[PDB]
Design a protein around this ligand. Structure first.
Ligand SMILES: NCCc1c[nH]cn1
Length: 384
């Protein structure tokens, strides 16, 4: 019964994304009051991604030395401490510390869980099938985070969503202790194909670049779209809120269906078509005149990014087996670094560009870049 390991990675990713999305509404409002009674706010937002990017390679190396369960449980402990600090700390410095620890725990959870899922699901088809579910864990977390945080903030109080998240994290830790049992440190058999050799690989680089650009598109789109909506359409707050909902719904459906549909169609073809579709949707976003015009391109963006992720993570695992030794911590650290590359410089660079040139020009540039990179996914196809 290795399904319990899938549940642990699903719960870990889901709770991580719940915390990440509950935090985004609550933190600016709380700060916009203590200061009374641009640089630092962006630093607080990007600290999680920056620290996760920094500590991904170290966790990738550590998983080879001490196995996966100890990093997974450590990621749990760090996440629980970060949740408690979010609950009870009300200073900006402590908020930054909590964000940095959340990033460290996110790195541990993501890298170790993806490596463990790759190692226990050695089959090519089942690897993608379960990684679709694991990736849909993040989509479910993103979907059910903001409403959960909002209702628990409005009805009970500020610390209630964080306390409930901490209780759910404690239950996740109890089941982790029951199934993983990190009683002792165990090493893996062989070495790990040092990162210097993995990054020289053109195919691993192509997969990481496709993931990075597909995620950077949405990472620049998500914070820079509401500003342009207020500039042009003068939409209401709730319209600014439900505009990106189709992207999340479509990402969930696309991930959960293409985790299985990518093997029969071809993972390279799925990534190529995903890049083309996300580029086309990003190009067509600026032409929408109202929310009803933005309903479909956001769906396309989310669907295509789901295809890209669900086809490219199993490509990373397959490439490490095909050309290197079968150790996955380092390669999935590479993939996580590719994700946080978009997640870190996404908002700031996107805003800077949208200030220098118009928002439609930024969207056009992102779309043409994605479409131009799409042919590069052809080289990922198997020789036969
Ligand atoms: N690691 C986050 C993957 C993702 C979800 N949505 C967009 N990208």
């Amino acid at each position: 019964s290795r399904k319990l390991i899938l549940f642990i990675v699903f719960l870990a990713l889901l709770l991580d994304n719940m915390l990440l999305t509950v935090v985004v509404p609550i933190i600016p409002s709380y700060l916009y009051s203590i200061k009374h009674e641009n640089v630092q706010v962006g630093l607080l937002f990007a600290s999680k991604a920056t620290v996760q990017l920094i500590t991904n390679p170290f966790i990738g190396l550590l998983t080879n030395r001490i196995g996966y369960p100890i990093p997974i449980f450590a990621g749990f402990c760090i996440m629980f401490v970060s949740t408690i600090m979010f609950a009870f700390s009300s200073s900006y410095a402590f908020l930054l510390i909590a964000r940095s620890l959340q990033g460290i725990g996110s790195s541990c959870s993501s890298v170790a869980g993806m490596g463990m899922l790759a190692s226990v699901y050695t089959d090519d088809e089942e690897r993608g099938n379960v990684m679709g579910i694991a990736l849909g864990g993040l989509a479910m977390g993103v979907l059910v985070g903001p409403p959960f945080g909002s209702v628990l903030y409005e009805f009970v109080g500020k610390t209630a969503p964080f306390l409930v998240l901490a209780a759910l994290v404690l239950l996740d830790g109890a089941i982790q202790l029951f199934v993983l049992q990190p009683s002792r440190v165990q090493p893996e058999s062989q070495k790990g194909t040092p990162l210097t050799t993995l990054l020289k690989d053109p195919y691993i680089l192509i997969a990481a670049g496709s993931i990075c650009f597909a995620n950077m598109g949405i990472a620049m789109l998500e914070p820079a779209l509401p500003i342009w909506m207020m500039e042009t359409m003068c939409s209401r707050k709730w319209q600014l809120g439900v505009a990106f909902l189709p992207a999340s719904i479509s990402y969930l459906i696309g991930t959960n269906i293409f985790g299985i549909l990518a093997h029969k169609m071809g993972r390279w073809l799925c990534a190529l078509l995903g890049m083309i579709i996300v580029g086309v949707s990003i190009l067509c976003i600026p032409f929408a005149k109202n929310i009803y015009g933005l309903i479909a391109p956001n769906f396309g963006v989310g669907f295509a990014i789901g295809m890209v992720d669900s086809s490219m993570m199993p490509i990373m695992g397959y490439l490490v087996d095909l050309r290197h030794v079968s150790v996955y911590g380092s390669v999935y650290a590479i993939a996580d670094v590719a994700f946080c590359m978009g997640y870190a410089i996404g908002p700031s660079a996107g805003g800077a560009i949208a200030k220098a040139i118009g928002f439609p020009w930024l969207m056009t540039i992102i779309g043409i870049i994605d479409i131009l990179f799409a042919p590069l996914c052809f080289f990922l196809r198997s020789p036969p």
